Design an enzyme around this catalytic site. Structure first.
Site, PDB file in Angstrom:
ATOM      1  N   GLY A  13      45.284  37.596  18.927  1.00  0.00           N
ATOM      2  CA  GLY A  13      44.176  38.442  19.341  1.00  0.00           C
ATOM      3  C   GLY A  13      44.562  39.759  19.990  1.00  0.00           C
ATOM      4  O   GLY A  13      45.740  40.104  20.066  1.00  0.00           O
ATOM      5  N   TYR A  15      44.662  40.477  22.937  1.00  0.00           N
ATOM      6  CA  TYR A  15      45.345  40.277  24.209  1.00  0.00           C
ATOM      7  C   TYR A  15      46.689  39.565  24.040  1.00  0.00           C
ATOM      8  O   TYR A  15      47.631  39.797  24.804  1.00  0.00           O
ATOM      9  CB  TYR A  15      44.449  39.481  25.157  1.00  0.00           C
ATOM     10  CG  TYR A  15      43.157  40.184  25.536  1.00  0.00           C
ATOM     11  CD1 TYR A  15      43.165  41.300  26.372  1.00  0.00           C
ATOM     12  CD2 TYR A  15      41.923  39.712  25.081  1.00  0.00           C
ATOM     13  CE1 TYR A  15      41.976  41.927  26.755  1.00  0.00           C
ATOM     14  CE2 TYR A  15      40.728  40.331  25.455  1.00  0.00           C
ATOM     15  CZ  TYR A  15      40.763  41.434  26.294  1.00  0.00           C
ATOM     16  OH  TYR A  15      39.587  42.023  26.697  1.00  0.00           O
ATOM     17  N   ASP A 123      33.265  43.941  23.359  1.00  0.00           N
ATOM     18  CA  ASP A 123      33.982  43.908  22.100  1.00  0.00           C
ATOM     19  C   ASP A 123      33.560  42.746  21.204  1.00  0.00           C
ATOM     20  O   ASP A 123      34.397  42.047  20.646  1.00  0.00           O
ATOM     21  CB  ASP A 123      35.492  43.864  22.361  1.00  0.00           C
ATOM     22  CG  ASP A 123      36.298  43.947  21.090  1.00  0.00           C
ATOM     23  OD1 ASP A 123      35.908  44.727  20.179  1.00  0.00           O
ATOM     24  OD2 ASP A 123      37.322  43.234  20.998  1.00  0.00           O
ATOM     25  N   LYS A 125      32.390  40.719  18.011  1.00  0.00           N
ATOM     26  CA  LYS A 125      32.702  40.816  16.595  1.00  0.00           C
ATOM     27  C   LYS A 125      32.624  39.391  16.068  1.00  0.00           C
ATOM     28  O   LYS A 125      32.671  38.449  16.836  1.00  0.00           O
ATOM     29  CB  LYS A 125      34.091  41.440  16.390  1.00  0.00           C
ATOM     30  CG  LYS A 125      35.224  40.792  17.162  1.00  0.00           C
ATOM     31  CD  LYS A 125      36.451  41.707  17.073  1.00  0.00           C
ATOM     32  CE  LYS A 125      37.452  41.439  18.167  1.00  0.00           C
ATOM     33  NZ  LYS A 125      38.583  42.423  18.050  1.00  0.00           N
ATOM     34  N   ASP A 141      35.462  35.346  24.921  1.00  0.00           N
ATOM     35  CA  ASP A 141      36.037  36.535  25.561  1.00  0.00           C
ATOM     36  C   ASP A 141      35.115  37.427  26.381  1.00  0.00           C
ATOM     37  O   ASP A 141      35.426  38.595  26.607  1.00  0.00           O
ATOM     38  CB  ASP A 141      36.791  37.380  24.530  1.00  0.00           C
ATOM     39  CG  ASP A 141      37.940  36.627  23.912  1.00  0.00           C
ATOM     40  OD1 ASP A 141      38.315  35.575  24.462  1.00  0.00           O
ATOM     41  OD2 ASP A 141      38.475  37.075  22.886  1.00  0.00           O
TER      42      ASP A 141
HETATM   43  N1  LIG Z   1      38.377  28.890  21.886  1.00  0.00           N
HETATM   44  C1  LIG Z   1      38.775  28.776  20.592  1.00  0.00           C
HETATM   45  O1  LIG Z   1      38.607  27.579  20.010  1.00  0.00           O
HETATM   46  C2  LIG Z   1      39.315  29.831  19.877  1.00  0.00           C
HETATM   47  C3  LIG Z   1      39.996  30.867  20.608  1.00  0.00           C
HETATM   48  C4  LIG Z   1      40.499  32.052  19.991  1.00  0.00           C
HETATM   49  N2  LIG Z   1      41.120  32.973  20.724  1.00  0.00           N
HETATM   50  O2  LIG Z   1      41.289  32.815  22.044  1.00  0.00           O
HETATM   51  O3  LIG Z   1      41.562  33.996  20.225  1.00  0.00           O
HETATM   52  C5  LIG Z   1      40.315  32.207  18.573  1.00  0.00           C
HETATM   53  C6  LIG Z   1      39.658  31.217  17.811  1.00  0.00           C
HETATM   54  C7  LIG Z   1      39.146  29.991  18.425  1.00  0.00           C
HETATM   55  N3  LIG Z   1      38.447  29.080  17.742  1.00  0.00           N
HETATM   56  C8  LIG Z   1      38.050  29.135  16.343  1.00  0.00           C
HETATM   57  C9  LIG Z   1      39.135  28.722  15.385  1.00  0.00           C
HETATM   58  C10 LIG Z   1      39.993  27.594  15.654  1.00  0.00           C
HETATM   59  C11 LIG Z   1      41.005  27.242  14.721  1.00  0.00           C
HETATM   60  C12 LIG Z   1      41.158  28.005  13.527  1.00  0.00           C
HETATM   61  S1  LIG Z   1      42.390  27.585  12.369  1.00  0.00           S
HETATM   62  N4  LIG Z   1      43.780  27.638  12.919  1.00  0.00           N
HETATM   63  O4  LIG Z   1      42.246  26.047  11.842  1.00  0.00           O
HETATM   64  O5  LIG Z   1      42.381  28.491  11.181  1.00  0.00           O
HETATM   65  C13 LIG Z   1      40.311  29.115  13.267  1.00  0.00           C
HETATM   66  C14 LIG Z   1      39.306  29.470  14.189  1.00  0.00           C
END
Ligand SMILES: NC(=O)c1cc([N+](=O)[O-])ccc1NCc1ccc(S(N)(=O)=O)cc1
Length: 294
Positions: A13, A15, A123, A125, A141
């Site tokens: 991300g 950050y 932000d 999105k 976030d």
């Molecule tokens: N709090 C979160 O659960 C989460 C946190 C972030 N982040 O901090 O940047 C991004 C996606 C997230 N979930 C959605 C998510 C989870 C797994 C996949 S994966 N690895 O199976 O493609 C994709 C999206």
């Protein structure tokens, strides 16, 4: 760290890198974000710490803030998918209107809560809107931007998306208001409906001009004070406004009316989250179950 167990690298991300991880003692599965560069500003740690109390069903819970070994990790509740992936998966058929409406309604409840507690996202999105199998959608976030400024590249050369940025930010206004989040959500609402980003700018000026080409170049009539904005230039081309019926077809007049209020140029005229929840568009809102393949 030994308190966890990195399952996978959820991604990267603005950050830092985010990992899906399991707490070795609680068995809890969480999202762990490693925050990007020196000694971690104490101002930031207090700000972030305050967000641990910002709890709402449509806000991704911040479980813990770890400042150890002079490093900063944010532990968040885990959700399996984001809205960007869901929209891509639903591209052939589109997300059904009842589900678009449910998601919009829930997101507005989340913003109403945050805004009443004087917390802005800044932000929003599709990638930070998370969904689960129960039909819930949550904002991730919130509050991180404040006490962390605006970044152009994530943590290591990664182009910041400008597609959802409000015009007042693009014109250099230094004092963002809750209205910037309503603008972003409007752009996301339009994207769910048409299945194409509303304003996919690839530079700050391209973003601004794409907005002007659709909504008309703003002037003192529709936006008092716009010509005195920091980055406003009298040389901006003057484009006429297009009709919403051509912008988000085939959305009905209730949806177009609400979107138009979320995309007003003047942040002071732009509808609040609280007021949007009362819009006639939500008269028949429900909470459908999305078809999720995990
Ligand atoms: N709090 C979160 O659960 C989460 C946190 C972030 N982040 O901090 O940047 C991004 C996606 C997230 N979930 C959605 C998510 C989870 C797994 C996949 S994966 N690895 O199976 O493609 C994709 C999206």
């Amino acid at each position: 760290m030994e308190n966890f167990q990195k399952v996978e690298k959820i991604g990267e991300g603005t950050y830092g890198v985010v990992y899906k991880a399991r707490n070795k003692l609680t068995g809890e599965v969480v999202a762990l974000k490693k925050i990007r560069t020196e000694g971690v500003p104490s101002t930031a740690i207090r700000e972030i710490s305050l967000l641990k109390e910002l709890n709402h069903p449509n806000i991704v819970k911040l479980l813990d803030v770890i400042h150890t070994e002079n490093k900063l990790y944010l532990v968040f509740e885990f959700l399996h998918q984001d809205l960007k992936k869901f929209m891509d998966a639903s591209a052939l058929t589109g997300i059904p209107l009842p589900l678009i409406k449910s998601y919009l309604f829930q997101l507005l409840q989340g913003l109403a809560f945050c805004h009443s507690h004087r917390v802005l996202h800044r932000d929003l999105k599709p990638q930070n809107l998370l969904i689960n199998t129960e039909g819930a959608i949550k904002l991730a976030d919130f509050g991180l931007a404040r006490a962390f400024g605006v970044p152009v590249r994530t943590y290591t050369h990664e182009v910041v998306t400008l597609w959802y940025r409000a015009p007042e930010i693009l014109l250099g206004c230094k004092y963002y208001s809750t209205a910037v989040d309503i603008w972003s959500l409007g752009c996301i609402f339009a994207e769910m409906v048409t299945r194409r980003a509303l304003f996919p700018g690839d530079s700050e000026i391209d973003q601004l001009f794409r907005i002007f080409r659709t909504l008309g170049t703003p002037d003192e009539v529709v936006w008092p004070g716009v010509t005195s904005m920091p980055d406003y230039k009298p040389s901006f081309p003057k484009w006429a406004r297009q009709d919403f019926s051509k912008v988000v077809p085939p959305l009905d007049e209730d949806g177009r009316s609400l979107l138009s209020q979320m995309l007003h140029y003047d942040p002071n005229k732009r509808i609040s989250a609280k007021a949007a929840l009362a819009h006639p568009f939500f008269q028949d809102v429900t909470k459908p179950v999305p078809h999720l393949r995990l």
